[PDB]
Each structure stands twice: as structure tokens, then as C-alpha cells.
Enzyme design. Structure first.
Site, short mmCIF file in Angstrom:
data_model
loop_
_atom_site.label_atom_id
_atom_site.label_comp_id
_atom_site.label_asym_id
_atom_site.label_seq_id
_atom_site.Cartn_x
_atom_site.Cartn_y
_atom_site.Cartn_z
N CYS A 120 0.79 -1.27 0.18
CA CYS A 120 0.09 -0.02 0.00
C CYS A 120 0.60 1.13 0.00
O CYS A 120 1.98 0.99 -0.13
CB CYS A 120 -0.98 0.05 1.14
SG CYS A 120 -0.31 0.18 3.11
N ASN A 155 2.48 1.72 3.88
CA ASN A 155 2.82 0.49 5.15
C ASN A 155 2.45 0.45 6.61
O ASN A 155 3.18 0.18 7.24
CB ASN A 155 4.47 -0.20 4.65
CG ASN A 155 4.72 -1.68 5.16
OD1 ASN A 155 5.86 -1.77 5.38
ND2 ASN A 155 3.66 -2.69 5.04
N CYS A 177 -1.30 0.84 7.56
CA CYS A 177 -2.58 0.40 7.65
C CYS A 177 -3.08 -0.91 6.85
O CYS A 177 -3.01 -1.77 7.56
CB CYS A 177 -3.75 1.58 7.37
SG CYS A 177 -3.37 3.24 8.15
N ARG A 178 -3.25 -0.69 5.58
CA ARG A 178 -3.81 -2.07 4.71
C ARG A 178 -2.76 -2.93 5.01
O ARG A 178 -3.18 -4.09 4.86
CB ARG A 178 -4.02 -1.56 3.21
CG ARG A 178 -5.38 -0.59 3.60
CD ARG A 178 -5.59 0.01 2.29
NE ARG A 178 -4.74 1.18 1.92
CZ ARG A 178 -4.57 1.75 0.72
NH1 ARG A 178 -5.41 1.72 -0.23
NH2 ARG A 178 -3.73 2.70 0.76
N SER A 179 -1.62 -2.72 4.05
CA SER A 179 -0.84 -3.94 3.91
C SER A 179 -0.42 -4.62 5.08
O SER A 179 -0.19 -6.04 5.05
CB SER A 179 0.54 -3.46 3.13
OG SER A 179 1.20 -2.80 3.41
N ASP A 237 -7.95 3.19 1.25
CA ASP A 237 -7.20 3.99 2.18
C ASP A 237 -7.73 4.65 3.43
O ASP A 237 -8.71 5.32 3.38
CB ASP A 237 -6.14 5.04 1.77
CG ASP A 237 -5.17 5.55 2.60
OD1 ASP A 237 -5.18 5.20 3.96
OD2 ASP A 237 -4.06 6.29 2.21
N1 LIG Z 1 -1.47 11.81 0.37
C1 LIG Z 1 -2.61 11.22 0.76
C2 LIG Z 1 -3.84 10.79 1.07
C3 LIG Z 1 -5.02 11.17 0.29
C4 LIG Z 1 -5.93 10.69 0.29
C5 LIG Z 1 -6.39 9.84 1.31
C6 LIG Z 1 -5.26 9.31 2.19
C7 LIG Z 1 -4.22 9.74 1.92
C8 LIG Z 1 -2.93 9.31 2.83
C9 LIG Z 1 -2.17 10.24 3.41
C10 LIG Z 1 -1.32 9.77 4.48
N2 LIG Z 1 -0.34 10.73 5.20
C11 LIG Z 1 1.05 10.55 5.18
C12 LIG Z 1 1.86 10.64 6.47
C13 LIG Z 1 2.59 12.05 6.86
N3 LIG Z 1 4.03 11.78 6.91
C14 LIG Z 1 4.49 12.55 7.87
C15 LIG Z 1 6.26 11.91 7.76
C16 LIG Z 1 6.59 12.35 6.22
C17 LIG Z 1 6.15 11.41 5.72
C18 LIG Z 1 4.56 11.60 5.44
C19 LIG Z 1 -0.97 8.37 4.70
C20 LIG Z 1 -0.04 8.09 5.57
C21 LIG Z 1 0.09 6.70 5.85
C22 LIG Z 1 -0.69 5.87 5.04
C23 LIG Z 1 -1.75 6.28 4.42
C24 LIG Z 1 -2.12 7.60 4.18
N4 LIG Z 1 -2.84 7.97 3.28
#
Ligand SMILES: N#Cc1ccccc1-c1cc(NCCCN2CCCCC2)c2ccccc2n1
Ligand code: VO4
Length: 154
Positions: free
Chosen positions: A9, A12, A14-16, A126
Site C-alpha cells: 500500500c 505500509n 494501515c492496509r498492507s 485507504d
Molecule cells: N496523500 C494522501 C492521502 C490522500 C487521500 C487519502 C489518504 C491519504 C494518506 C495520507 C497519509 N499521510 C502521510 C504521512 C505523513 N507523513 C509524515 C512523515 C513524513 C512522511 C509523511 C497516509 C499516511 C500513511 C498511510 C496512508 C496515508 N494516506
């Protein structure tokens, strides 16, 4: 002959890690874990080294399952090492297919986990910005699809 699967995903967290944990419980329950190598990976940077989301942890616990996984990014070697690479959504698929082209002896078959659902819910969405019931959905989709996959390739 031993087989290998890598669940993927965006992050890595939540889903995977759920899909990996579900598949692992299935093979263990069926007394065939000796014939499988199993892991989970991210397309993205965002969570490297972190443990799964609390929501995934509690969901898994509700179903009697624990994970010790730490978030990791997918690599070129993963495309040569794994028999199957199963991903959650169309973005993931696109991303994976693009990366696999720069890998010269790519062997993995790259497919949506959802393509194996008998209920035909092709997309595993997601759940990061949703709630506990969205985690639960993802867990049930995972169970349906991993059961079907294992029937078909065991
Ligand atoms: N972009 C988008 C998005 C758009 C629509 C629906 C969901 C998402 C979305 C946004 C996330 N945040 C990132 C984490 C912040 N970090 C902070 C540290 C640096 C690196 C990033 C997700 C994080 C983990 C798993 C699934 C995620 N999914
Ligand atoms: O941590 V994932 O459900 O993109």
C-alpha cells in the site's frame, strides 16, 4: 516448492500490515507456513520504520491477531524475489507497474488483492483519514480475498 507473497500500500502502516497478518494467520491455521515467505511493503517514504497505526493494531487484536512489522519501502530486488505482489488500489498498481519496468529480470506477478474477492469489491480504500469501522471493512476484505487467493495458488 515454497512460494512468496509481498502485500503493498501507500504507507505500509494501515492496509498492507493487515493483509500480511491475515494471510500469515491463514497459512499457519492450515499448517502450511513452511511453504510460504510473506512480507508487506510501501510504495512511499511517509512512514519508514514505524509500527502499524493504533487502529490496525486494535482491529487485529479484535480478531486474535498481532503484528511485529516495521514499515519498509519496496525495492527493485522485491520484483525479482517475490512470486506475487498484491496491492490495494489503482494508484498502487500504477506505481508498482512503472517501477517494475526499470527491473530487468522482474519475475513477480503484480495484481490487485481485490481481484480475488468473491464479493467483487475490487478496491481496498485507504482508511488513514477515517475511523475504526473503516479499519474493520479493510480487515474483512483482506480475509475474503486472502482465502480465495490461497485456494487458487496453494
Ligand atoms: N496523500 C494522501 C492521502 C490522500 C487521500 C487519502 C489518504 C491519504 C494518506 C495520507 C497519509 N499521510 C502521510 C504521512 C505523513 N507523513 C509524515 C512523515 C513524513 C512522511 C509523511 C497516509 C499516511 C500513511 C498511510 C496512508 C496515508 N494516506
Ligand atoms: O499504510 V496504507 O493503508 O497506504
Amino acid at each position: 516448492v515454497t512460494k512468496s507473497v509481498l502485500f503493498v500500500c501507500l504507507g505500509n502502516i494501515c492496509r498492507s500490515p493487515i493483509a500480511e497478518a491475515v494471510f500469515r494467520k491463514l497459512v499457519t491455521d492450515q499448517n502450511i507456513s513452511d511453504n510460504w515467505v510473506i512480507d508487506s511493503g510501501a510504495v512511499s517514504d511517509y512512514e519508514v520504520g514505524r509500527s502499524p497505526d493504533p487502529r490496525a493494531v486494535s482491529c487485529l487484536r479484535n480478531h486474535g491477531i498481532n503484528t511485529a512489522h516495521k514499515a519498509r519501502q519496496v525495492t527493485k530486488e522485491d520484483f525479482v524475489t517475490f512470486d506475487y505482489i498484491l496491492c490495494m488500489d489503482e494508484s498502487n498498481l500504477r506505481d508498482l507497474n512503472r517501477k517494475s519496468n526499470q527491473v530487468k529480470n522482474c519475475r513477480a506477478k503484480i495484481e490487485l488483492l481485490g481481484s480475488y474477492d468473491p464479493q467483487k469489491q475490487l478496491i481496498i480504500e485507504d482508511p488513514y483519514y477515517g475511523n475504526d469501522a473503516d479499519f474493520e471493512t479493510v480487515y474483512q476484505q483482506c480475509v475474503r480475498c486472502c482465502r480465495a487467493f490461497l485456494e487458487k495458488v496453494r
